[PDB]
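Page header: ASSEMBLY MODEL / three components / 761 residues total.
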Amino acid sequence: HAENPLREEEWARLNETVIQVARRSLVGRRILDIYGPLKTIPIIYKDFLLHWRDIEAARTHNMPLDVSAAAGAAALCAQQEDELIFYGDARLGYEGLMTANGRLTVPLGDWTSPGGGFQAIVEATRKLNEQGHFGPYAVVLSPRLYSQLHRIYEHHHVLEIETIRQLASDGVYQSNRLRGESGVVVSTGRENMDLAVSMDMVAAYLGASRMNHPFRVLEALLLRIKHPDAICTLE
Amino acid sequence: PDFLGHAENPLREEEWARLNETVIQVARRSLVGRRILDIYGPLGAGVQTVPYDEFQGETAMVFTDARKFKTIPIIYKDFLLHWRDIEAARTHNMPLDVSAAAGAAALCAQQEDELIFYGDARLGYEGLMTANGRLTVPLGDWTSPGGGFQAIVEATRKLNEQGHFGPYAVVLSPRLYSQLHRIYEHHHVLEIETIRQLASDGVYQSNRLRGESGVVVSTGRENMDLAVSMDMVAAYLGASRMNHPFRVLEALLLRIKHPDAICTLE
Amino acid sequence: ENPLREEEWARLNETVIQVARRSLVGRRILDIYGPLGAGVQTVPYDEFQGQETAMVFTDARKFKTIPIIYKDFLLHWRDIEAARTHNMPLDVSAAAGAAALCAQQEDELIFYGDARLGYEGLMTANGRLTVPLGDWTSPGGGFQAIVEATRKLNEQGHFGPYAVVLSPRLYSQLHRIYEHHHVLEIETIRQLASDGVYQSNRLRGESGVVVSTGRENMDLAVSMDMVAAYLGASRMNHPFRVLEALLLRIKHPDAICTLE
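Prediction written out in full:
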């Protein structure tokens, strides 16, 4: 009975798997600047379990350990983090980018006809430029609008996504946490908004319950919106 | 000399290295399944059974694991070498001819892809295109531009409705893959690229797929992987008469853990 | 007896090799079996297959002799002395011309063989597959031709990756610029031939070939790579020769498709 059922190499391969899985499924960290690592700070976590006979076989038979449950937990944690970033938490009195008070709004418009999305983005950028924030811009869209921007038409000679990217030098991305037809344009920069991270996504041992081994993947972060006028939501 | 008596090793170290390198190089360039799946292993040739599910958890108690186990099959192909050829290679200082090993490795790779994509119902194995519990979308019409884009969009939406968010990989039959590369007037863009911004894990073609068919998979280690016990290798079977038989072989298995992460184009 | 030293010989051989490499097309789509040595003169053509009187066993494979391709050039003694005294490097243009002619001969032999000596080529093999050429002036003709060729090759169990070799006229026609098209067909064709699309000047008229690569289908048996040799002393001149010896082996004729 000890507080470390894993060796050093197994720990390294579990932690690198967690980091690698978290890296490829995060969208909110690609438009924000990280202020850390270091008002209540929320904690996001997900648990998984390991069988003791599997560890005994891995160490005795000289075979690699299976780390799929950690990958699943990390994917769920990344989904939770994106949900918190985009929509916040009403129970804790937290606001996201899509619900911040004092943000500008524009009508979504007709997107079926070619050029509608470009007109909407231009109108949002125009309203943003009126309030003193002028570039660089980043655009986040729901899967429906993102797929609709990739339609192929005749005599257009260019994909509308590149026409949009001409304006949004930071980038245009798709997010699954957005519901229905939704989009957001943000003026990037640490002076407008940022993310304060207290503890990165890491795995921790909880102690042996019965004879099996529980582990938890967890992290702690907060979103600080200093200027609410640098966000324009399509609705 | 060295052929007048029974011997355990007819080749020297350099030619064993060259043969194994040839086998590996031939194997790597003709495998499509390994470009979209994670690898669990190598586990060792002594491992013959592997779990299929994920671990969940007055008198005495009896505990029995609820996971399902399965045996790992072997894929192999044989070839033969002439003894005078080896004698001439050693005596005249000539490189040895290793084409038969390349042919055997190509056949083994084809068999591996066939097992991965369609399985084997006689032995109880399932493939990506025959799994039970997978999703399905109509194929539609791919003669006009935009049909493939619409089909992929519909498949991605149905995958998203079940909590699988990507990134996605697409595998197509040669006919659909060729149709995706056609050229039309005023369009100025190929539909393959437009599809490629929707599947960030890649779009591939496989000759194992039949007629007009395709599969979209939400990649992830927790959804599916490949359990490998032994990669392709060459072994000496022992001299029969005076010639030398060899075998190229491998052992692996496909594990489908979430069947609803697959969408086939029907 | 030889009018050159180690460094001059090395420079001559280096120039010959560099001229040879840049101009050889068939060596970019074929595997090499060798070098085997200058003493090897015969090579097998097929793959090996396994009382009161003694037994007699004979091999069932076929064998062929390896030919030699060569070209002669000259070097003058006064220029050698001037280079040695001045220390300026020698003039080696004749060797480059000889190497270019040898490369042309090798490419012609690979692509068309020699009917008199019973040597086959890719364009004249017996048992190969053929597809109609169609009309390459309008867009899509080359794409359709390559798609048909690859489909017919796939029907016989050869899955690629494929390589395409074309005559100059077809290569030029796959580079035209039409009105509101903005996409070159050569890129689309290159996206289907994973091993490459190449241009060859030995191909006659409008023609092309699609091959499925692999040592088990075809390779090149090289006994001696291109090299230079001294022929002796004649008056004051110094004759030299550039020569090589190699052969092409076709094992599966149905892995080749020609564009009729």
